[PDB]
Amino acid sequence: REHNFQPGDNVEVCEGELINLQGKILSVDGNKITIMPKHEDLKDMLEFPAQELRKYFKMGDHVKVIAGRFEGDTGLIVRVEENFVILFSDLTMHELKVLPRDLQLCSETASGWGELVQLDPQTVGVIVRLERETFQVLNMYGKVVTVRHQVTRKKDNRFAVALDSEQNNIHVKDIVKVIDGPHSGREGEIRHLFRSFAFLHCKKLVENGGMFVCKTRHLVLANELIGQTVRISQGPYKGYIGVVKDATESTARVELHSTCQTISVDRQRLTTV
Amino acid sequence: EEDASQLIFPKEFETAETLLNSEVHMLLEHRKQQNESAEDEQELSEVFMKTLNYTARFSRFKNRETIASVRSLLLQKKLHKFELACLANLCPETAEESKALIPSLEGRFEDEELQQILDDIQTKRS
Amino acid sequence: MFYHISLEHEILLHPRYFGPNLLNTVKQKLFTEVEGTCTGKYGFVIAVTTIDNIGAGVIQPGRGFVLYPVKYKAIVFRPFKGEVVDAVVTQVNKVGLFTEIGPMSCFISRHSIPSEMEFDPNSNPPCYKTMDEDIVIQQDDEIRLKIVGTRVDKNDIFAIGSLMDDYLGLV
Amino acid sequence: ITESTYSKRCRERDFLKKVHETVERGGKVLIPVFALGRAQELCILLETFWERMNLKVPIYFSTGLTEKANHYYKLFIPWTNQKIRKTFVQRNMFEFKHIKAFDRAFADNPGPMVVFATPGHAGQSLQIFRKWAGNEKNMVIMPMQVEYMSFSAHADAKGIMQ
């Protein structure tokens, strides 16, 4: 057997003269805890061992799973039987059947991520689920792929512009409706952008953590000169030899060989030597 | 912590005046009257007219004189404001029903005069 | 249930609104950014009935924005422990029931009532049906239910409804 | 074993007249291309028209694939028409003196200009189509004024008969 009692949890008494007393755990020990539970309407302080206790919770409190197949999931209970306790998860509305010993009282928020990855340097993607050795990534396919850890990272274009069916400008974190395609009728939020695709999120959608992709037009809003030695062939600095440190379409930063200056020269006055 | 059986409220709500369903309806429809009077102003989201139709199709009273009369007879007897709102909005049919709705009504009022005041409000419901 | 209490809010007004319509802009900003919000203490606000006063506008040092404390009266509505609340019923799935009391995603499970009430899929409109098939709980009807639970879900509430008490049916 | 799936001067003259009338009114055209042969034919016909009328308002083509097609068409002169081979000694006709590379169509600068879109939809055309909708001359010619000028790339029935 095993005992895992944490402070703040609600426990009950299943046998003895002090039965049906619910208290809050303060501390814990190994085998004979001699625990100190804060009972309701009782200022005199009692002692209870580990075998007498049982993790009974009041109805409508945040619960977490310590171990088992349902571990890592939170929710709210419905009714605690002798040994049959059910709860609905915060992510999906699937009924979870858990043992009463495998429940704990915690106030933390559920986790339930979504960074931009590169399967190959021509394709981008967003991971939908964190696994131990693989990445589950939903690309612009509608199909979830399974790739190894060693994908690369691409800089996201947070200032990108996309166009819907009404030719209206949309950007990141914008709610858009789906009116065409295989999944018309749903609604999503923009996370990353492409030339003709947009990534969508719906918190009510339960498949792959809410990640989905839709096309942009099927929605609606709801230098070589660098490092080169040049000659200034025109102007007041005519004849000076320099190396281009920086250049634009019009001007260039020329590091003069003879002086300690770097000067801005118009590129029409420069001759590559 | 908070409960209705022991009437445990947060400490800031000592003057928390509670409005009846038709009072909420008349205030909300007055807000729409002023909003329609307010030109060049955007309309509000689905929550407002959602609450408005919830107060419409579940309204217990229809004329403001009925609310005035029920309040004017209810403040004379010793009631809590939350108890007053629960009694005036639950719309009971029998006295034992009125006891069985809220645990805070257990033993607060005598059964015969409770039957009398339900007879009064059942005469003035429409 | 609907209360009528006093709330507090702070308005950060940009300097571009420092004109003849300043206080009106403050009221418009308040009406913009208090609607459609829920909190775990003061409940989900319905609407602002009136504004008591607009406080003194303290100019923040280092920013152009002015901070305006606002005292106003707003209708709030939250679940309560041990109270019977009127509800709205919609279509029924094979697992549960969709109830919407305003913004409330209240749910009814199979571990809140004895087996006197059942659900069948044989009828074309899904509804809750007993063995006698007397009471019908389908879309758009009047029921009563009791809520004890309340939870916070990022300005959303998750709760559980109960039907243990008698005469909690249609009128 | 032959294909079997199925005027030209008049269509080319009408397309050139439409382009000239739209560019002489100060507006900009956004004709798209989807095939390489149609793109090269449109560029060469445009370039000889611009050289013949001798007007200097620019024509631009986009993408990193149409440039590769231009280079390969430049390197394969013997596989071209009689005029391109015969007048090659004067000048390479695929070395365009008027059609230049589009740095986002000169950053979408104002004025009359000709722009070639990468697809025939997809990216690098819809931004131009939305940026020029409801303009003075919004002439976009698929194979907000919309014109229809189609060039046949395959043979017709009489060509197969011949």
Swiss-Prot record, chain A:
DNA binds at R195. It comes from Homo sapiens. Residues 5-36, 57-88, 170-203, 224-257 form the KOW domain. Changing K154A: Reduces the affinity for Pol II elongation complex. Interacts with SUPT4H1 to form DSIF. DSIF interacts with the positive transcription elongation factor b complex (P-TEFb complex), which is composed of CDK9 and cyclin-T (CCNT1 or CCNT2). DSIF interacts with RNA polymerase II (Pol II); forms DNA and RNA clamps that stabilize Pol II elongation complex while maintaining the nontemplate DNA strand in the transcription bubble and nascent RNA in the exit channel. This interaction is reduced by phosphorylation of the C-terminal domain (CTD) of POLR2A by P-TEFb. Changing R153A: Reduces the affinity for Pol II elongation complex. Ubiquitously expressed. Changing R158A: Reduces the affinity for Pol II elongation complex. Changing R153E: Reduces the affinity for Pol II elongation complex. The modification N6-acetyllysine is found at K238. RNA binds at K155. Methylated by PRMT1/HRMT1L2 and PRMT5/SKB1. Methylation negatively regulates interaction with P-TEFb and RNA polymerase II. The gene is SUPT5H. Component of the DRB sensitivity-inducing factor complex (DSIF complex), which regulates mRNA processing and transcription elongation by RNA polymerase II. DSIF positively regulates mRNA capping by stimulating the mRNA guanylyltransferase activity of RNGTT/CAP1A. DSIF also acts cooperatively with the negative elongation factor complex (NELF complex) to enhance transcriptional pausing at sites proximal to the promoter. Transcriptional pausing may facilitate the assembly of an elongation competent RNA polymerase II complex. It is found in: Nucleus. Belongs to the SPT5 family. This is Transcription elongation factor SPT5.
Swiss-Prot record, chain D:
It is found in: Nucleus; Cytoplasm. Sumoylated; sumoylation regulates its subcellular location and is required for integrator complex integrity. The active site is at E3. It is linked to Neurodevelopmental disorder with motor and language delay, ocular defects, and brain abnormalities: An autosomal recessive disorder apparent from infancy or early childhood, and characterized by global developmental delay, intellectual disability, motor and speech impairment, and brain abnormalities. Specifically, brain imaging shows progressive cortical atrophy, cortical gyral simplification, and delayed myelination affecting cerebrum and cerebellum. Ocular defects can include optic atrophy, nystagmus, strabismus, and retinal dystrophy. RNA endonuclease component of the integrator complex, a multiprotein complex that terminates RNA polymerase II (Pol II) transcription in the promoter-proximal region of genes. Component of the Integrator complex, composed of core subunits INTS1, INTS2, INTS3, INTS4, INTS5, INTS6, INTS7, INTS8, INTS9/RC74, INTS10, INTS11/CPSF3L, INTS12, INTS13, INTS14 and INTS15. The core complex associates with protein phosphatase 2A subunits PPP2CA and PPP2R1A, to form the Integrator-PP2A (INTAC) complex. INTS11 is part of the RNA endonuclease subcomplex, composed of INTS4, INTS9, INTS11 and inositol hexakisphosphate (InsP6). Interacts with WDR73; interaction is required for the assembly of the RNA endonuclease subcomplex in the cytoplasm. This is Integrator complex subunit 11. It comes from Homo sapiens (Human). The chain holds residues 201 to 400 of 600 of the full protein.
